[PDB]
Amino acid sequence: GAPATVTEQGEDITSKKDRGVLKIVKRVGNGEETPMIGDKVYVHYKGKLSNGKKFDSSHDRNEPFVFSLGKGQVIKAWDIGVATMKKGEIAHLLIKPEYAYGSAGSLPKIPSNATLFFEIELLDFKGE
Numbered sequence: 047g048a049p050a051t052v053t054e055q056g057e058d059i060t061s062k063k064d065r066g067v068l069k070i071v072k073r074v075g076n077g078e079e080t081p082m083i084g085d086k087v088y089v090h091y092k093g094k095l096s097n098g099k100k101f102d103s104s105h106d107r108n109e110p111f112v113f114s115l116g117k118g119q120v121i122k123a124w125d126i127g128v129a130t131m132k133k134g135e136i137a138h139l140l141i142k143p144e145y146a147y148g149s150a151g152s153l154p155k156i157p158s159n160a161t162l163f164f165e166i167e168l169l170d171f172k173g174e
């Protein structure tokens with residue numbers, strides 16, 4: 047399923063080309079502007095440990111997740127991945143620890159050296 051499909055078929059969107067962040071577009075977005083660093087961005091997401099063992103959704107708060115792009119208010123993989131997305135796009139991200147919580151992890155939610163999977167829909171972005 048989705049994590050393995052990203053491993054096998056994802057595009058490497060890292061500058062380093064170390065496969066730290068792999069992407070597949072699931073549904074195409076509208077127009078051709080992606081957000082610029084500093085933009086306030088609005089998403090829905092479903093996430094989990096690649097293990098499948100914990101799971102997490104914006105829908106659980108019943109409202110979109112908002113943050114400011116590339117100001118590291120989210121993991122590096124999100125600052126990277128979301129920057130590549132067009133409005134209304136849905137993407138799958140598979141993320142090595144180096145672009146998430148690293149060998150330190152973030153307990154109790156995230157263990158050491160965890161690979162994370164997300165499905166992300168980009169709803170909108172505004173130039174804060």
Ligand SMILES: COc1cc2cc(OC)c1OCCOC[C@H](C)OC(=O)[C@@H]1CCCCN1C(=O)[C@H]2C1CCCCC1
Pocket residue numbers: 091093094095100101102111119120121124152155156162
């Ligand atoms: C480690 O702490 C959490 C992780 C996540 C959800 C949490 O609560 C909703 C959470 O505690 C609140 C702090 O948030 C941390 C940052 C902002 O989170 C992110 O960078 C990323 C990407 C943006 C959405 C949340 N992300 C997460 O890593 C989730 C995580 C939970 C377990 C399954 C894998 C995803």
